[PDB]
Enzyme design. Sequence first.
Site, PDB file in Angstrom:
ATOM      1  CG  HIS A  33     -23.943  -5.557 -26.784  1.00 14.01           C
ATOM      2  ND1 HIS A  33     -23.655  -6.457 -27.790  1.00 14.01           N
ATOM      3  CD2 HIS A  33     -22.788  -5.247 -26.137  1.00 14.01           C
ATOM      4  CE1 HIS A  33     -22.356  -6.679 -27.731  1.00 14.01           C
ATOM      5  NE2 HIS A  33     -21.790  -6.025 -26.728  1.00 14.01           N
ATOM      6  CG  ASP A  63     -25.085  -7.618 -30.591  1.00 11.53           C
ATOM      7  OD1 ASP A  63     -25.348  -6.360 -30.424  1.00 11.53           O
ATOM      8  OD2 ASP A  63     -24.578  -8.271 -29.705  1.00 11.53           O
ATOM      9  N   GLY A 139     -14.622  -5.525 -23.948  1.00 14.93           N
ATOM     10  CA  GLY A 139     -13.895  -4.436 -24.648  1.00 14.93           C
ATOM     11  C   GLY A 139     -13.857  -4.741 -26.153  1.00 14.93           C
ATOM     12  CB  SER A 141     -18.741  -5.577 -27.567  1.00 13.38           C
ATOM     13  OG  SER A 141     -19.211  -6.654 -26.799  1.00 13.38           O
ATOM     14  CB  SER A 156     -22.593 -10.515 -30.652  1.00  9.86           C
ATOM     15  OG  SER A 156     -23.688 -10.638 -29.720  1.00  9.86           O
TER      16      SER A 156
END
Lengths: 185, 51
Positions: A33, A63, A139, A141, A156
């Site tokens: 993402h 992801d 932040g 991720s 994720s």
Amino acid sequence: ISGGDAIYSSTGRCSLGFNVRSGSTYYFLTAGHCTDGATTWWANSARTTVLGTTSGSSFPNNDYGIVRYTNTTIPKDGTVGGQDITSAANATVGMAVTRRGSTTGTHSGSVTALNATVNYGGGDVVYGMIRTNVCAEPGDSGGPLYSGTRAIGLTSGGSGNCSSGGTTFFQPVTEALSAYGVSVY
Amino acid sequence: VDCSEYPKPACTYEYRPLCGSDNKTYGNKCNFCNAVVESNGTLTLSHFGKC
């Protein structure tokens, strides 16, 4: 730069998951993402230090994403912060794990479930996820989830927060290594 | 930003900040929108970016 450090794209900030390679080619993994629609990645908010450009991106459904390094001088440590990473493994229920991300730093917890389905809405559904009781916040991720010197997953998403406690889902890293034919070092 | 599709059980965690009327920086829209819901529509957007 190592696992957990910030990474900036044209749109926002994520975290570097793990430094990986194939042959003499260095890449880094992060969340899909995060790589979706990003081309270039930088090391600083000023966008002055280039890291590389996206080479792959899989989101939703999975992801994970991978960015190929184009910066020649930046050190690419095979660690998460100071932590050496020497191998990748499959998560297991009850496993003790640690996450590192660019906003909240390092937090620990355990694997509570496998094969979870998380629905982020608007058709963004991801499958096959590790569920944990580790918190994370915007932040974070794409940062690494690891256990000792073992690489386990990539942040994720989830709910809650670090103050009050939360649940975070992670993409299995093994899956990403196999799709891109790269390995941790 | 429209929070009608909210609430959402989970949010991704990229960082693209928004500034709420409570003076708090929200890390992304998903996070901001669940807060709006949780506040029963009382919280609004002050502007984009950090507060």
